[PDB]
Amino acid sequence: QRYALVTGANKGIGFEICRQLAEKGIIVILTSRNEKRGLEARQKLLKELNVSENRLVFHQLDVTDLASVAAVAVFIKSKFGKLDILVNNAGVSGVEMVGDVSVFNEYIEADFKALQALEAGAKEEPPFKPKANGEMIEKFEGAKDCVVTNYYGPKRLTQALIPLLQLSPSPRIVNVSSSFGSLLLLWNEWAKGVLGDEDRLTEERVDEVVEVFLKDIKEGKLEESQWPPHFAAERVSKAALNAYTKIAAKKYPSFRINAICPGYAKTDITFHAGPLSVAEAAQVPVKLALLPDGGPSGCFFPRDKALALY
Ligand SMILES: NC(=O)c1ccc[n+]([C@@H]2O[C@H](COP(=O)([O-])OP(=O)(O)OC[C@H]3O[C@@H](n4cnc5c(N)ncnc54)[C@H](OP(=O)(O)O)[C@@H]3O)[C@@H](O)[C@H]2O)c1
């Protein structure tokens, strides 16, 4: 029997990851930071799956709360004795909208277009201002929450669950990153060199990058910095997550540890805009959670590359 834990699973992609793994016969620990939302999610999904009660287990988990993280490791040890699959799905954007919320989608569309141009060799990210009457507000508190959730969360939960994952015959970690973690989007030349220098990459180096970013947004104005012009904490945190994916994969070679982008999908975080359904999005992390032994590890896969892997 295989056991999978999914973070941020009361809604969105994480809820659908739980569905798709459970349909494979994997026993899923659906976790969520709010107990009521998670219990209700478990009830709804058990109904929709139409399977017996033991196929889906709820446990509270806030990935920014070190006691919460420790407690779920104790629970898994006592109830199951091992873990086979960890999906680090929980995430936040670091952005507060003012005015017309579809401005969030305007910036997403602009940044995918910019990434395509940079991936094709363009040297510069085009400047962007939105059309509709709204703006993305990026403050220190949001950025800190974004970094602590998106980067420290997966790192700390990975570290807490290593002893249980080591008892699996095929240990799997999937980190739900985003395409906006590309170093092409990160702007900061020091940080791009650090996160890109794989032979010198350590957890200490990545922690240092994100802490310099947070100090910069706290203490001054990012427009004067060499950090990104917008989605700054999203970019930094997801780049840091991708780097930690590589660090962990090298440290735990018997595991397969990968980062993915699910594609642009309709969830609360995107105001339910984007071309993909939430079921379509979850296909990507599920694909890497079921990767056969010997497959790639330590990598970042965007959607189409992920789905083509086998
Ligand atoms: N949708 C897209 O287009 C897209 C594209 C690329 C990457 N992603 C990534 O996909 C992941 C899932 O987001 P989504 O699109 O499914 O959005 P979503 O519907 O907003 O779901 C986010 C989930 O994360 C949970 N969460 C947030 N902070 C948490 C914390 N401290 N501890 C535990 N759970 C926490 C949320 O819980 P609450 O209900 O309590 O807030 C919710 O369950 C994120 O990591 C995001 O960066 C999404």
Distance of CA 223 to the CA centre of its chain: 26
Q: Which residues are CB-neighbours of 267 under 8 A, at least 6 positions away?
A: 11, 12, 13, 274, 278, 281
Enter the tokens of residue 102.
Answer: 């579809």
Query: Which amino acid would we find at residue 247?
Result: I
Strand-pairing partners, residue 135, are 98
* Closest to 285 measured CA to CA, from 12, 10, 1, 2: 12
Distance of alpha carbon 283 from alpha carbon 242, whole angstroms: 19
- For this experimental structure, what is the resolution in angstroms? 1.7
End-to-end CA gap in the chain:
23
The residues with which 134 forms a beta bridge, in sequence order, are 99
| Residue 189: φ, ψ to 5° | -65, -40
Give pairs for 62-71: CB < 8 Å, separation 24+.
Answer: 62/33, 63/7, 63/8, 63/33, 63/88, 63/90, 63/149, 63/152, 63/153, 63/154, 63/156, 63/157, 64/145, 64/148, 64/149, 64/152, 64/153, 65/33, 66/156, 68/33, 69/156, 69/157, 69/160, 70/160
Ligand 1 atom nearest to 91, measured from its CA: 45
Can you state the angle between helices 189-196 and 203-219, rounded to 10 degrees?
A: 160
CA distances (Å), 171 to each of 75, 186, 236, in order?
18, 31, 27
Strands 27-32 and 300-301: unpaired
Which pair of structure tokens corresponds to residue 204? 């200490």
The partner residues of 259 in beta bridges, in order of sequence, read: 175, 300
Helix ranges (H only) for 53-139 are 66-79, 103-119
CA distances from 280 to 112, 203, 262 (A): 18, 32, 8
Domains contained in the chain, number: 1
Residue 255 tokens, joined: 């595991």
Q: Is 11 in the pocket of ligand 1 (CB under 6 A)?
A: yes
What are the structure tokens assigned to 231, written together?
């989605």
- The whole domain housing 296 covers 1-310
Q: What distance in Å separates the CA atoms of residue 210 and residue 230, rounded to the nearest whole number?
A: 16
Query: 30 has which bridge partners?
Result: 6, 58
CATH number, domain of 124, equals 3.40.50.720
Tokens linked to 106: 């305007």
The answer to whether the CB of 181 is under 6 A from ligand 1 is: no
Contact predicate 240/206, CB 8 Å:
yes
Position in ligand 1 atom list of the atom nearest CA 264: 3
Tokens of 176: 């739900």
Is ligand 1 within 6 A of the CB of residue 16? no
CA–CA–CA angle 78, 34, 30 (5° rounding): 45
Residue pair 53/47 in contact by the 8 Å Cβ criterion: no
Question: Furthest-apart CA pair in the chain: how many Å?
Answer: 57
Q: Taking a C-beta distance cutoff of 8 angstroms, is the pair 297, 249 a contact?
A: yes
Sheet holding 27-32, edge to edge: 56-60, 27-32, 3-6, 85-88, 172-176, 256-260, 300-301
CA of 10 to the centre of ligand 1 (A): 9
Secondary element (H or E) of residue 85: strand 85-88
Gap between the Cα atoms of 88 and 175, Å rounded: 5
E strands, the chain, are 3-6, 27-32, 56-60, 85-88, 96-99, 134-137, 172-176, 256-260, 300-301
- CB of 18 closer than 6 angstroms to any ligand 1 atom: no
Are 69 and 160 in contact, with CB atoms under 8 Å apart?
yes
